[PDB]
Design a protein around this ligand. Structure first.
Ligand SMILES: O=C(O)CNC(=O)C(=O)O
Ligand SMILES: [Mg+2]
Ligand code: NI
Ligand SMILES: [Zn+2]
Length: 331
């Protein structure tokens, strides 16, 4: 069995190996990469996403979100308070202001210590889930707006044509902006490209151990768990590495830098934080191996998680028994 300890693997494809996305994903899996839940892919030195980032300041962040924490330093939830629209140029200046800027630090480990010690005491502002792309249309390899759609994958594997579309999203971050513990919708893959700026630290639990995380989360968030059998789908719960180690949960950590891709694998729980002002682009995707995970994915039917149009068909075709309950939660 490849990668039996479930370590995060890092890949350095050549330009020729970067031509066929599906083939390279399947290659990474042949080496055991999925067992970690997360892999890093460093593009060939010949490749670029676009020419420059000099012309992005006029992108609008229609609904910036202030991430307000409740709890204790290592175990907290966050809610998202809506703020007035601002441009990416305005958001960059905010991120670099004395109130929000990254503090002085020694290295990535010291910054991680500071994050876990102090996150709860501040409320950073996050631009999330903005439909769009920063890949040049003439970038032909690993262009996250030109991938095969998940609807076409389900049709190729199972024969059923379905409605829906699959497009990328932009994320504008600052110091302390946080992504809560979650798997992807319908336990899909994701791919994330860090276009510019400061790093992103990731934490991940191996798919084979995901239920261990879920059991800890039910213990640590007992009211949320009573509310919804799939409450991690609400994307609000944070648990620190120290707390995970105290409870014997298997996990790994890695820091993504500008110019690097990360891939999350089906049913790989992940969480993390941004080091400072940055811009990432991400999209969900599928492969033949995902279908069996999609059929088994939990679902939120309580009303909180509220998702994309395109999840309807995936539930309808892969989970017909759950469809009626799930849909009542969406209305
Ligand atoms: O960059 C982010 O906002 C965090 N992204 C993801 O959870 C992802 O790509 O799965
Ligand atoms: Mg612009
Ligand atoms: Ni994710
Ligand atoms: Zn729910």
């Amino acid at each position: 069995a490849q990668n039996p300890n479930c370590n995060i693997m890092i890949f350095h494809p050549t330009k020729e190996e970067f031509n066929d996305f599906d083939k390279y994903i399947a290659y990474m899996e042949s080496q055991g990469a999925h067992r970690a839940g997360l892999a890093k892919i460093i593009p060939p030195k010949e490749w670029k996403a676009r020419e420059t980032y000099d012309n992005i300041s006029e992108i609008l962040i229609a609904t910036p979100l202030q991430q307000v924490a409740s709890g204790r330093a290592g175990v907290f939830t966050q809610y998202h308070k809506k703020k007035k629209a601002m441009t990416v140029g305005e958001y960059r200046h905010l991120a670099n202001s004395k109130k929000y800027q990254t503090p002085p630090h020694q290295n990535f480990e010291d910054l991680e210590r500071k994050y876990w010690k102090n996150r709860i005491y501040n409320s950073p502002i996050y631009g999330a889930d903005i439909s769009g792309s920063l890949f040049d249309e003439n970038t032909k390899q690993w262009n996250l707006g030109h991938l095969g759609t998940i609807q076409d994958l389900l049709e190729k594997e199972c024969g059923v044509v379905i409605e829906g579309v699959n497009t990328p999203y932009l994320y504008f971050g600052m110091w302390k902006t946080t992504f809560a513990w979650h798997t992807e919708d319908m336990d899909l893959y994701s791919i994330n490209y860090l276009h510019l700026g400061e790093p992103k630290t990731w934490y991940v639990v191996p798919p084979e151990h995901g239920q261990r995380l879920e059991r800890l989360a039910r213990e640590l968030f007992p009211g949320s768990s009573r509310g919804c059998g799939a409450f991690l789908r609400h994307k609000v719960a944070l648990i620190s590495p120290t707390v995970l180690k105290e409870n014997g949960i298997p996990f790994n950590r890695i820091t993504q830098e500008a110019g690097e891709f990360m891939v999350t694998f089906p049913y790989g729980y992940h969480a993390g934080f941004n080091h400072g002002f940055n811009c990432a682009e991400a999209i969900n995707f599928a492969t033949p191996r995902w279908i069996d995970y999609g059929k088994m994915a939990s679902q939120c039917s309580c009303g909180e998680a509220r998702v994309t149009f395109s999840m309807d068909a995936f539930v309808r075709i892969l989970q017909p028994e759950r469809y009626d309950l799930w849909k009542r939660g969406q209305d």
